[PDB]
């Protein structure tokens, strides 16, 4: 199999974390794609009119309260 980058077609700036447009969960960085298709949908790579996206990332947990 080929388990590597995605170069995302939206930033390509090495797509390290993970957002799965669905259902052609096709891996674009966190929720970068989002950005991308709520303007301009039928997904960049295979224009399909995305449902929902998934961030199967790992150990995250950012910040100390919301604002401060
Ligand atoms: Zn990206
Ligand atoms: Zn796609």
Redesign the pocket.
């Given at each position: 199999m080929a388990t590597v980058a995605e170069r995302?077609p939206?930033?390509?700036?090495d797509?390290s974390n993970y957002s799965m447009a669905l259902p052609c969960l096709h891996a674009?960085?966190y929720v970068?794609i989002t950005r991308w298709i709520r303007q301009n949908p039928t997904c960049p790579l295979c224009k399909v009119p995305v449902e929902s996206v998934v961030h199967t990332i790992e150990s995250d947990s950012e910040f100390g309260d919301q604002l401060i």
């Open positions: 995302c939206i930033c390509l700036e797509p674009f960085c970068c």
